[PDB]
Write a protein that binds this ligand. Structure first.
Ligand SMILES: C=CC(=O)Nc1cc(Oc2ccccc2OCCn2ccc(=O)[nH]c2=O)c(C)c2cc(C#N)ccc12
Lengths: 401, 547
């Protein structure tokens, strides 16, 4: 009920980002939602003296037919001054279960600094540019802005103080509009505890990180090897020598001496079996000298494997993976590659938020025009990461399969 | 006097750290000075401007051409940025047919909306004196000046705020605003429509805004932004392709302007060759001879632009369809319609700048473009008619290393059909010969070698001049494709070649790649395997080509 002064970074103007075109039903949904928010004082119409703009669109989250308003505050977030910090809970990922809650409504009860409101301007577009766009600016803390959790941190501490004092074994983390609650209870006890916390927050998404581990490089176990099998094995081992030092392939390449048919079976020599066994032992160990640096960006690479299977690696330095994974979940996206990719990006970003408390920069195996045309149709999260586009097919794809 | 409602001013500032303009007034002739004195006297009598004392340090030049012309370029450089709402014009194909339609130009548009009083001092201008023997007459603007940076945005927002309640309480009509003209449409009877137009003129009069007392001088067809708007249809203003003995660069740019503009309603307009003649010219007066491809293309453009073709208006109750045809050389053409033979609009898509490509990627890109354009114009994605079999698309997207998606579509059998020209095997082929290929070149003399050794003892090495490593790796693969049967396994260490072939092109800039493609099309089964180089893998003979 008392506004805290908020400014931008020195030398940076407000965001001026073009609003992209929206379908008619999304425009209508935003008209109704923004009308209600205006009746509630959360937003106010603005005149042409406000040159700033931030894109807006509408989504439909899980298990709900009601539309939701999503603002792409990426530019404003990177242009907003750095708020300060709380060390990331390194035990949130260790906990057995974590539940994600949307505490976005709580932000709308705290007013926003006056002189800063003009930087949160957004535009409801019109079809065919017939009528001018409906321009609004926020009067309260907006959902999606990085300053909203930083400002509300004190109030959130006061609200969560009794529950924290009651259960010292429950870990609580906050990122943007989401609250991550980790524990080790039973699924039923966890659900009843989550209802207890949501009614505790009312009067004022099952995740299981324990069922997630890092993935090793595995080699085939065969009784008869063809020329092709040994060639692929030598390729994968040669690629893995960039990650593990002692990888040695000369005794296996010695088997490929001569111009033999690809499907011809080759028996392994004793030196080749010993070499392959030593390589297995090397691959069973973790990578040498792999650390996290909070001052560096996280990079996430995704490969499409086919049959709804996807692989990903989060790292900071090449060949120094901090996390690897294989998302193969099938949820109403059997016939749509882009929807699968979008859900995969959301899951990887969620895991990244749980582990390090920030979002990675993605390298997407998709053309820019396709992704930018369709990704908002399948987005259900309140945050948005950064992404770039991979146009050359990477050779290492099958080495993650 | 009936009280006129006040129009709320828009608070305006200058750019941060900057100051108002201070420009020396130009010396004017006695005639121009007298004319400007008369005009500014009348405007001061009307209230648009006001005389100011010597305290105002700012000044903006003034001219007479009589008509007064104030040059606000410096103040425009120094004025803050505004939210310009005119970005992209309404496309006629997006309009919805109405029984009765009226156009109302507003009189004294900018001059009927007041200016922020704290900002008026920056609009100061002086009228020179006769023989400059007295201090010039100092004025400042009290309303939105013509040519000032903020006039269109402030005027449009004010007009919107004024029109909001009338549009709210008259849902049976549609109102749109554009510059100094309003478009009002309705499906009511002509009497009810003219009545509601009178109600709108009264509503605008309540804020002191003037509408045509006479009948509106603009009646259908309306000529607007190169468009012809008719009661039941729309088209482009007439496009005439002139006859020229010699075509220069500006004639070719005029021709590609008329063709690019005419392509949005005329189906089949091609501009690849005529725009290709302009590649890397940067000379407006340079005469460029016409290739026979550009002459044939221009002849087909004249055959399409022979008789007028019109587009219909949008009917939201009918489905939206978009049909695509391949035209060749990376050209694609499309029609968006709701009924057969009656197009809403048309257009084209040219492939991007690339070294390798295939038809499926280009069709995908064109689909994305049409989707975005349709969402802009009509607020929905159309159903597509595409010249590609369902089986072809399924094989492509299921086997493609990138993620890809086309919205709801159906196959239309209108040749040339987009197809997959070759498909590599997933596993080695039993009974097929295995060609181990390699190539290598010298970086200084540009001499190299490319060849293969196979499991049946077949061998070949060919020496090459003026080549590179990449060229010799491709050439080695090409030799293996030339000398093998219908089924063949090929082993290479070239990450470059595998990077090219795994992108699945059917056309390339490199003639060597295109020859490889032509060979792949003739094969029954091809398995391409990769191994690391210099790792002692027998068969992979780097030494055989480094001699
Ligand atoms: C946002 C774009 C927009 O509104 N543009 C426009 C609309 C318009 O009329 C309408 C006004 C209100 C609702 C729909 C309208 O048109 C529906 C289609 N239509 C168009 C012509 C006609 O005769 N009959 C018919 O049904 C007219 C006369 C326009 C005239 C100029 C000129 N100069 C430029 C733009 C115009």
């Amino acid at each position: 009920i008392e506004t805290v002064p908020v400014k931008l970074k020195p030398g940076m103007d407000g965001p001026k980002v073009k609003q992209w075109p929206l379908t008619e039903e999304k425009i209508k949904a935003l008209v109704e939602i923004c009308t209600e928010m205006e009746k509630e004082g959360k937003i106010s119409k603005i005149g042409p003296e406000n040159p700033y703009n931030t894109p807006v669109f509408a989504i439909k989250k899980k298990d709900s037919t009601k539309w939701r308003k999503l603002v792409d505050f990426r530019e404003l977030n990177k242009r907003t001054q750095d708020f300060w910090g709380i060390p990331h809970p390194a035990g949130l990922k260790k906990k057995k279960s974590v539940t994600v809650l949307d505490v976005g409504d709580a932000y709308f009860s705290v007013p926003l600094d006056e002189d800063f409101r003009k930087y949160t301007a957004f535009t409801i577009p019109s079809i065919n540019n017939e009528t001018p766009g409906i321009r609004y600016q926020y009067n309260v803390l907006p959902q999606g802005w990085k300053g909203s959790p930083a400002i509300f941190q004190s109030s959130m501490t006061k609200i969560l103080e009794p529950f924290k004092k009651q259960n010292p074994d429950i870990v609580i983390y906050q990122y943007m509009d989401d609250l991550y609650v980790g524990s080790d209870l039973e699924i039923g006890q966890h659900r009843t505890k989550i209802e207890e916390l949501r009614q505790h927050l009312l009067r004022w998404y099952e995740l299981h990180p324990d069922k997630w581990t890092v993935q090793p490089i595995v080699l085939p176990e065969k009784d008869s090897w063809t020329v092709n099998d040994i060639q692929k094995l030598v390729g994968k081992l040669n690629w893995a020598s960039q990650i593990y030092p002692g990888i040695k392939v000369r005794q296996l390449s010695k088997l490929l001496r001569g111009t033999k048919a690809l499907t011809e079976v080759i028996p392994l020599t004793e030196e080749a079996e010993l070499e392959l066994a030593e390589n297995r032992e090397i691959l069973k160990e973790p990578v040498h000298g792999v650390y996290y640096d909070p001052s560096k960006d996280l990079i996430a690479e995704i490969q499409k494997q086919g049959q709804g299977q996807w692989t990903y690696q989060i790292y900071q330095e090449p060949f120094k993976n901090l996390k690897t994974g294989k998302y193969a979940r099938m949820r109403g996206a059997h016939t749509n590659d882009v929807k699968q990719l979008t859900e995969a990006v959301q899951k990887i970003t969620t895991e990244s938020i749980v582990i390090w408390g920030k979002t990675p920069k993605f390298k997407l195996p998709i053309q820019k025009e396709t992704w930018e045309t369709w990704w908002t149709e399948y987005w259900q999260a309140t945050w948005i990461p950064e992404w770039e586009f991979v146009n050359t097919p990477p050779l290492v794809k099958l080495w993650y399969q | 006097m009936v009280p006129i409602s006040p129009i709320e001013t828009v608070p305006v500032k200058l750019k941060p750290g900057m100051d108002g303009p201070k420009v020396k007034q130009w010396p004017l002739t006695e005639e121009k000075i007298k004319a400007l004195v008369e005009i500014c006297t009348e405007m001061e009598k009307e209230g648009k401007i006001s005389k100011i004392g010597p305290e105002n340090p700012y000044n903006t030049p003034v001219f007479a051409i009589w008509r007064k012309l104030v040059d606000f370029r410096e103040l425009n450089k120094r004025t803050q940025d505004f939210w310009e709402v005119q970005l992209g014009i309404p496309h006629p194909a997006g309009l919805k047919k109405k029984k009765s339609v009226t156009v109302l130009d507003v009189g004294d548009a900018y001059f009927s909306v007041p200016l922020d009083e704290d900002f008026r001092k920056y609009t100061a201008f002086t009228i020179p004196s006769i023989n400059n023997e007295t201090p010039g007459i100092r004025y400042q603007y009290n309303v939105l000046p013509q040519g000032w940076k903020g006039s269109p945005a402030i005027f449009q927002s004010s007009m919107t705020k004024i029109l909001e309640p009338f549009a709210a309480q008259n849902p049976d009509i549609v109102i749109c605003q554009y510059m100094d003209d309003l478009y009002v449409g309705s499906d009511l009877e002509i009497g009810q429509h003219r009545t509601k137009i009178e109600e709108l003129r009264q509503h605008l009069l309540r804020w002191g805004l003037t509408t045509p007392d006479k009948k509106h001088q603009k009646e259908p067809p309306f000529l607007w932004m190169g468009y012809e708007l008719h009661p039941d249809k729309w088209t482009v203003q007439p496009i005439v392709l002139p006859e020229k003995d010699s075509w220069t660069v500006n004639d070719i740019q005029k021709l590609v302007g008329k063709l690019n503009w005419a392509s949005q309603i005329y189906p089949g307009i091609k501009v690849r060759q005529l725009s290709k003649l302009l590649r890397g010219t940067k000379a407006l007066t340079e005469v460029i001879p016409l290739t026979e491809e550009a002459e044939l293309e221009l002849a087909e453009n004249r055959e399409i632009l022979k008789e007028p073709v019109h587009g219909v208006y949008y009917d939201p109750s009918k489905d939206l369809i978009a049909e695509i045809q391949k035209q060749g050389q990376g050209q694609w053409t499309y029609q968006i319609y709701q009924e057969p033979f009656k197009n809403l609009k048309t257009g084209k898509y040219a492939r991007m700048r690339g070294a390798h490509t295939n038809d499926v990627k280009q069709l995908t890109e064109a689909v994305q473009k049409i989707t975005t354009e349709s969402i802009v114009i009509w607020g929905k994605t159309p159903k597509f008619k595409l010249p590609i079999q369902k089986e072809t698309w399924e094989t492509w997207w299921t086997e493609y290393w990138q993620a890809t998606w086309i919205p709801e579509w159906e196959f239309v059998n209108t040749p040339p059909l987009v197809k997959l020209w070759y498909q590599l095997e997933k596993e080695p082929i039993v009974g097929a010969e295995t060609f181990y290929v390699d190539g290598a070149a010298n970086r200084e003399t540009k001499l190299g070698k490319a060849g293969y050794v196979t499991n049946k003892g077949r061998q070949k090495v060919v020496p090459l001049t003026n080549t590179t490593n990449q060229k010799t790796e491709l050439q080695a693969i090409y030799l293996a494709l030339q000398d093998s049967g219908l089924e063949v396994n090929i082993v290479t260490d070239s990450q470059y070649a595998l990077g090219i072939i795994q992108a699945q092109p059917d056309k390339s800039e490199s003639e060597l790649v295109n020859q490889i493609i032509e060979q792949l099309i003739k094969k029954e089964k091809v398995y391409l395997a990769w191994v690391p180089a210099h790792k002692g893998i027998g068969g992979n003979e780097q030494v055989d080509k480094l001699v």
